[PDB]
Coordinates of C-alpha atoms and ligand atoms in Angstrom, one line a residue:
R1 CA 10.4 -18.8 1.7
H2 CA 13.4 -19.6 4.1
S3 CA 15.1 -16.2 2.6
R4 CA 12.4 -14.1 3.0
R5 CA 11.7 -15.2 6.5
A6 CA 15.3 -14.5 7.3
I7 CA 15.1 -11.1 6.1
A8 CA 11.6 -10.2 7.6
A9 CA 13.5 -11.3 10.8
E10 CA 16.4 -9.0 10.5
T11 CA 13.9 -6.3 9.7
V12 CA 12.2 -6.7 13.1
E13 CA 15.4 -6.7 14.7
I14 CA 16.5 -3.5 12.9
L15 CA 13.4 -1.7 13.9
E16 CA 14.3 -3.0 17.5
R17 CA 17.5 -1.7 17.4
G18 CA 17.1 1.2 15.7
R19 CA 19.9 1.1 13.0
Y20 CA 21.3 -1.2 10.6
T21 CA 24.5 -1.7 8.7
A22 CA 24.9 -0.9 5.0
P23 CA 26.6 -2.8 2.7
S24 CA 29.4 -0.4 2.8
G25 CA 29.6 -0.8 6.1
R26 CA 27.9 2.7 7.0
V27 CA 25.4 2.2 10.3
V28 CA 22.6 4.1 9.4
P29 CA 20.0 5.4 12.2
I30 CA 16.7 5.0 12.2
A31 CA 15.3 5.0 15.4
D32 CA 14.0 8.7 15.2
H33 CA 12.0 8.7 11.6
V34 CA 10.6 5.1 12.8
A35 CA 9.5 6.7 15.8
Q36 CA 7.8 9.6 14.1
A37 CA 6.1 7.6 11.4
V38 CA 4.8 5.5 14.6
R39 CA 3.6 8.7 16.5
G40 CA 1.8 10.0 13.2
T41 CA 0.4 6.9 12.4
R42 CA -3.5 7.5 11.8
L43 CA -6.5 5.5 11.5
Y44 CA -9.9 6.6 9.8
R45 CA -13.0 5.5 10.0
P46 CA -15.5 4.9 6.9
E47 CA -17.7 8.3 8.1
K48 CA -14.7 10.0 8.6
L49 CA -13.0 9.4 5.1
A50 CA -16.6 9.8 3.7
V51 CA -16.1 13.6 5.1
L52 CA -12.8 14.3 3.8
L53 CA -14.9 13.1 0.4
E54 CA -17.3 16.0 0.6
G55 CA -14.3 18.5 0.3
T65 CA -1.4 15.1 -14.2
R66 CA 1.2 13.0 -15.6
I67 CA -0.3 9.0 -15.3
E68 CA 2.1 6.6 -16.2
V69 CA 2.1 2.8 -15.9
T70 CA 5.4 1.0 -15.4
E71 CA 6.5 -2.7 -14.7
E72 CA 8.1 -1.2 -11.3
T73 CA 7.4 -2.6 -7.7
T74 CA 6.0 -0.2 -5.7
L75 CA 9.1 0.7 -3.7
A76 CA 10.8 1.0 -7.0
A77 CA 8.4 3.5 -7.9
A78 CA 8.2 5.2 -4.5
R79 CA 12.1 5.6 -4.9
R80 CA 12.7 7.3 -8.5
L81 CA 9.9 9.6 -8.0
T82 CA 11.6 10.6 -4.5
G83 CA 15.1 11.2 -6.0
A84 CA 13.2 13.7 -8.7
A85 CA 11.7 16.1 -6.1
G86 CA 11.0 16.7 -2.6
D87 CA 7.7 16.3 -1.9
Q88 CA 6.9 13.4 -0.2
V89 CA 5.5 10.1 -2.1
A90 CA 2.4 8.0 -0.9
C91 CA 2.0 4.5 -1.8
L92 CA -1.3 1.9 -1.7
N93 CA -0.4 -0.7 0.4
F94 CA -2.2 -3.8 -0.9
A95 CA -3.1 -4.5 2.7
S96 CA -4.3 -7.6 4.5
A97 CA -7.4 -6.8 6.8
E98 CA -6.1 -8.9 9.5
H99 CA -2.7 -9.3 9.9
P100 CA 0.0 -6.3 10.1
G101 CA 2.2 -6.9 7.5
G102 CA 0.4 -10.3 5.8
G103 CA 2.4 -13.0 6.3
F104 CA 5.7 -11.8 6.1
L105 CA 7.2 -13.1 9.0
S106 CA 6.3 -16.5 7.7
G107 CA 8.5 -15.5 4.5
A108 CA 4.7 -15.3 2.3
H109 CA 5.5 -13.2 -1.0
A110 CA 3.2 -10.5 -2.4
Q111 CA 3.0 -6.8 -2.3
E112 CA 2.7 -6.2 1.6
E113 CA 5.1 -8.4 2.9
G114 CA 7.6 -6.5 0.8
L115 CA 6.7 -3.4 1.9
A116 CA 7.0 -4.6 5.6
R117 CA 10.4 -6.3 5.0
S118 CA 11.5 -3.1 3.3
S119 CA 10.7 -0.7 5.2
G120 CA 9.1 0.8 9.0
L121 CA 5.9 -0.1 8.1
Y122 CA 5.2 -2.9 10.4
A123 CA 5.9 -0.9 13.0
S124 CA 3.3 1.6 12.3
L125 CA 0.7 -1.4 11.6
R126 CA 1.4 -3.1 14.5
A127 CA 0.5 -0.1 16.6
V128 CA -2.8 0.1 15.0
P129 CA -4.7 -3.0 16.8
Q130 CA -8.4 -1.5 16.5
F131 CA -8.0 -2.2 12.4
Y132 CA -7.1 -5.5 12.6
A133 CA -9.4 -6.2 15.5
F134 CA -12.6 -4.9 13.7
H135 CA -11.7 -6.8 10.6
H136 CA -11.5 -10.2 12.8
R137 CA -14.7 -9.9 14.6
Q138 CA -16.3 -8.6 11.0
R139 CA -15.4 -11.9 9.3
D140 CA -16.6 -10.6 6.2
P141 CA -14.3 -10.9 3.0
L142 CA -15.7 -7.6 1.9
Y143 CA -13.7 -5.8 4.9
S144 CA -14.3 -2.4 5.6
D145 CA -13.3 1.4 3.9
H146 CA -11.1 1.6 7.2
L147 CA -7.7 2.8 6.5
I148 CA -4.4 3.4 8.1
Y149 CA -2.3 6.1 7.3
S150 CA 1.3 5.7 7.7
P151 CA 3.3 9.1 7.1
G152 CA 7.0 9.3 6.9
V153 CA 8.2 5.7 6.8
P154 CA 11.4 4.9 6.4
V155 CA 12.4 2.6 3.4
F156 CA 15.7 1.2 3.5
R157 CA 15.9 -2.4 1.1
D158 CA 15.8 -2.5 -2.6
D159 CA 13.9 -4.9 -4.4
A160 CA 16.4 -7.9 -3.8
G161 CA 16.4 -6.9 -0.4
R162 CA 19.8 -5.1 0.0
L163 CA 20.4 -2.8 2.9
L164 CA 20.4 0.9 1.4
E165 CA 23.3 3.4 1.8
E166 CA 21.0 6.1 2.2
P167 CA 17.0 5.5 3.0
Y168 CA 14.4 7.2 2.0
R169 CA 10.5 8.0 3.3
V170 CA 7.1 7.5 1.8
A171 CA 3.7 7.9 3.2
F172 CA 1.8 4.5 3.2
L173 CA -2.1 4.5 2.8
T174 CA -3.4 1.0 4.2
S175 CA -6.9 -0.4 2.8
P176 CA -7.7 -4.2 1.8
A177 CA -9.0 -4.5 -1.5
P178 CA -12.6 -6.9 -1.1
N179 CA -11.6 -10.4 -0.8
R180 CA -13.1 -11.5 -4.7
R181 CA -11.8 -15.1 -4.2
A182 CA -13.7 -15.8 -1.0
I183 CA -16.8 -13.9 -2.2
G184 CA -17.0 -15.7 -5.5
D185 CA -20.2 -15.3 -7.5
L186 CA -22.2 -14.5 -4.3
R187 CA -22.2 -10.7 -5.2
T188 CA -22.3 -9.4 -8.4
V189 CA -20.2 -7.3 -11.0
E190 CA -21.6 -4.3 -10.4
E191 CA -21.5 -4.7 -6.4
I192 CA -18.0 -5.5 -6.4
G193 CA -17.4 -2.4 -8.1
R194 CA -19.5 0.1 -6.3
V195 CA -17.4 -1.6 -3.3
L196 CA -14.0 -0.8 -5.1
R197 CA -14.9 2.9 -6.3
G198 CA -15.7 4.1 -2.9
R199 CA -13.3 2.5 -1.1
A200 CA -10.4 3.6 -3.9
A201 CA -11.9 7.3 -4.0
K202 CA -11.3 7.3 0.4
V203 CA -7.7 6.4 0.0
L204 CA -7.7 9.4 -2.4
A205 CA -9.3 11.1 -0.4
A206 CA -6.9 10.3 2.5
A207 CA -3.7 10.6 0.0
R208 CA -5.1 14.6 -1.0
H209 CA -6.0 15.3 3.0
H210 CA -2.5 14.6 3.7
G211 CA -0.8 17.1 0.8
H212 CA 0.1 14.5 -1.1
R213 CA 0.5 15.0 -5.1
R214 CA 2.3 12.2 -6.1
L215 CA 0.9 8.6 -5.8
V216 CA 2.3 5.1 -6.3
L217 CA -0.8 3.0 -7.3
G218 CA -1.0 -0.5 -8.8
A219 CA -3.5 -3.8 -9.2
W220 CA -4.9 -3.7 -6.0
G221 CA -6.2 -6.9 -4.3
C222 CA -5.5 -8.3 -8.1
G223 CA -3.5 -11.2 -6.3
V224 CA -4.7 -13.0 -3.8
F225 CA -7.5 -11.2 -3.4
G226 CA -8.7 -12.3 -6.5
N227 CA -9.9 -9.1 -7.9
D228 CA -10.2 -8.4 -11.7
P229 CA -7.6 -6.1 -13.1
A230 CA -9.2 -4.7 -15.7
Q231 CA -12.4 -3.6 -13.2
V232 CA -10.0 -2.5 -10.4
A233 CA -7.9 -0.3 -13.7
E234 CA -11.5 0.9 -14.7
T235 CA -12.1 2.0 -11.2
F236 CA -8.8 4.5 -10.7
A237 CA -9.6 5.6 -14.4
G238 CA -13.5 6.5 -13.3
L239 CA -11.9 8.7 -10.5
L240 CA -9.0 10.4 -12.3
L241 CA -9.9 10.4 -15.4
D242 CA -13.1 12.0 -17.9
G243 CA -14.0 14.6 -15.5
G244 CA -13.8 12.5 -12.4
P245 CA -13.8 13.3 -8.6
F246 CA -10.1 13.4 -8.5
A247 CA -9.1 14.4 -12.4
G248 CA -6.5 17.1 -12.2
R249 CA -5.9 16.9 -7.9
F250 CA -3.0 14.8 -8.5
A251 CA 0.3 15.6 -10.1
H252 CA 1.9 12.5 -10.7
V253 CA 0.4 9.1 -10.3
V254 CA 2.0 5.9 -11.2
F255 CA 0.2 2.5 -12.1
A256 CA 3.7 0.7 -10.6
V257 CA 2.4 -3.3 -11.4
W258 CA 5.2 -5.8 -11.2
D259 CA 3.6 -9.1 -12.5
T260 CA 6.0 -11.9 -12.7
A261 CA 2.9 -14.6 -14.0
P262 CA 3.2 -15.2 -17.5
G263 CA 2.0 -12.6 -20.0
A264 CA 2.3 -10.3 -17.0
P265 CA -1.7 -9.7 -17.0
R266 CA -2.2 -7.4 -14.1
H267 CA 0.2 -5.1 -15.8
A268 CA -1.1 -5.8 -19.3
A269 CA -4.6 -4.6 -17.9
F270 CA -3.4 -1.6 -16.6
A271 CA -1.2 -0.5 -20.1
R272 CA -4.3 -1.1 -21.7
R273 CA -6.8 1.0 -19.6
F274 CA -3.7 4.1 -19.1
Ligands
A1R1 N1 5.9 -5.4 -5.2 C1 5.3 -5.4 -5.7 N2 5.0 -4.3 -6.8 C2 3.9 -3.7 -7.5 N3 2.9 -4.4 -8.2 C3 3.0 -5.7 -7.7 C4 3.9 -6.3 -6.4 N4 4.0 -7.4 -5.9 C5 2.8 -8.1 -6.9 N5 2.3 -7.2 -7.6 C6 1.6 -7.1 -8.7 O1 0.1 -6.6 -8.0 C7 -0.9 -8.0 -7.5 C8 -1.7 -7.7 -6.5 O2 -0.5 -7.8 -5.2 P1 -1.0 -8.3 -3.9 O3 -0.3 -8.4 -3.3 O4 -1.2 -10.4 -4.3 O5 -2.2 -7.9 -3.5 P2 -3.6 -8.6 -2.8 O6 -4.5 -7.3 -2.5 O7 -4.5 -9.1 -4.3 O8 -3.4 -9.6 -2.0 C9 -3.4 -9.4 -0.5 C10 -3.2 -10.0 0.7 N6 -1.4 -10.3 -0.1 C11 -0.4 -9.5 0.9 C12 -0.9 -9.3 1.9 O9 -0.7 -9.2 3.4 C13 -2.8 -9.1 1.4 O10 -3.2 -10.1 2.3 C14 0.0 -9.0 -8.4 O11 -0.8 -9.7 -8.3 C15 1.0 -8.5 -8.6 O12 0.7 -8.7 -10.3

């Protein structure tokens, strides 16, 4: 936790100073790209996403979200979109406290926090709502510079990705007070809106994963099935993306989140 906390603090300083020093000694400017990402950040309310809905190579890997994004970005020039497994309540989750989860890693490694911290309406809505289902609100963050690898090392050459920030329902907090089918409907509606936003913004290649299946305690078979219904068997997004990677990095024994996605896809 202490090493992650230190890295998080360094990233915040970097975003303030607008440059960082790579291991070679190269000083890398990022202010322009960060400012662009912030200025282009958009909050989508549920009903706007619903409007977007009125209008493929599939891989499962043990990659982190960022490792998959970096691989895809090196292979072609079209900007990749990545799903941020978001906190409903804090931009970048607990990254500044040294918390260890997917969003926190994104926030330690990129300009994502500068984008999300600029959308207080998203977080205020959920704070007032006080409901663990959260909502279909989504933050779209274009061209966010990514400048660390999985180990926290600064990159000689940063790359840019779009992020889609949407919180999965906190099934852990809900317990058995909603049915499997109710949660499935919430997941399907929300995932459809994530995909609609990605497509709306011209992203043909996506990095998805075990959304909500860690701290939020969702069932990875159900989350994998949710994406499958949308992307496969003549679903609404079948054939609409060029490349979808389910990058599932699961350090628990048996890597069960990854196993569930591998089984389905
Ligand atoms: N970096 C990364 N890449 C890919 N997959 C990952 C990664 N880190 C974890 N995982 C896998 O994805 C699963 C879900 O990750 P998690 O970050 O726990 O997402 P949640 O939606 O359940 O939790 C979110 C909340 N945690 C941090 C945020 O601030 C949100 O509060 C997790 O169980 C792992 O199997």
